[PDB]
Design a protein around this nucleic acid. Sequence first.
DNA 1: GGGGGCATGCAGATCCCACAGGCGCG
DNA 2: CCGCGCCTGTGGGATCTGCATGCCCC
Length: 287
Amino acid sequence: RRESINPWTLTGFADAEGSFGLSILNRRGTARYHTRLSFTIMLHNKDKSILENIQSTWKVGSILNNGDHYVSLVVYAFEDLKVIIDHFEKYPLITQKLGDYKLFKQAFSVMENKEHLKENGIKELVRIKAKMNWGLNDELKKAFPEVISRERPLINKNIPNGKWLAGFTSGDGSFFVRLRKSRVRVQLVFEISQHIRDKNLMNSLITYLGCGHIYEGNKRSWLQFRVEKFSDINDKIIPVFQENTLIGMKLEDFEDWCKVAKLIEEKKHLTESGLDEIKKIKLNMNK
DNA sequence: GGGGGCATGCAGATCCCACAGGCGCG
DNA sequence: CCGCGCCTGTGGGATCTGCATGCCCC
Ligand SMILES: [Ca+2]
Ligand SMILES: [Ca+2]
Ligand SMILES: [Cl-]
Ligand SMILES: [Cl-]
Ligand SMILES: [Cl-]
Ligand code: NA
Ligand code: NA
Ligand code: NA
Ligand code: NA
Ligand code: NA
């Protein structure tokens, strides 16, 4: 269907915005636990169509409101997780979140085998949870004080294809237009920010795209891959996402963005009339 | 028949996004 | 001189992540 999302683009978007959760909460009855596995993407409700298209591609998950500005797709039901696992086995994540998925998959197998009901089975879930995301809370640490290891292998993966990069960029990327006054100057920029735990992957964008720069700051837990040279934006960045379509509102930013690139390519941004259309397109992107 | 799991949420923490200014270089 | 773009810097909210529990069903 027209609303289907390329499975690599979906994995790339998951690498950007998704989250694998393992909730282990006290249940009342003596020493019983709620055990909840989940995959979640929460967005501004201006991008609810993304979540609906993902739900339509996978045929699992429930869309819910969060506040008045946000909306999330949550996959949680036991059989629904098998569809998540089957997709990610075949279209694997490449950021550090691969580690979280693999622990999530490991907890799933523990629960599918009913091992978390045996006398010494919840401790295994706690051990898995401690390695996921932000690890254990204080309460779980007090109830399982012997579970201290957060060691897990670091993920080292290459960008698999442009479909993945389109999904990743649709999440964590940015296409914007700069105007600077010395004459009013125009500048197209492309940037992706990311936590330094994936510094190798972000570094590799320079090779994979044949342009750009990695900036880190002298302060900083996150870095930026950025392209500021116009001919790199025109000859390398724009063709890559023409071949691999972005999703959500960022595709609209891109389409507006390229319209500015066409104007500047024709040198028609120097024209006072050409610059005035650039200001209009930019005012439209602010929406 | 107690719990395991679902349905359906709410709440906290931070990693992003969409930028701006200074300035050298060709 | 001039325009490009390398390089530094960042506010704050859209993300990422964690927390909650009554109901259903075997
Ligand atoms: Ca991200
Ligand atoms: Ca995003
Ligand atoms: Cl949820
Ligand atoms: Cl983290
Ligand atoms: Cl223990
Ligand atoms: Na949710
Ligand atoms: Na950015
Ligand atoms: Na170039
Ligand atoms: Na956007
Ligand atoms: Na984090």
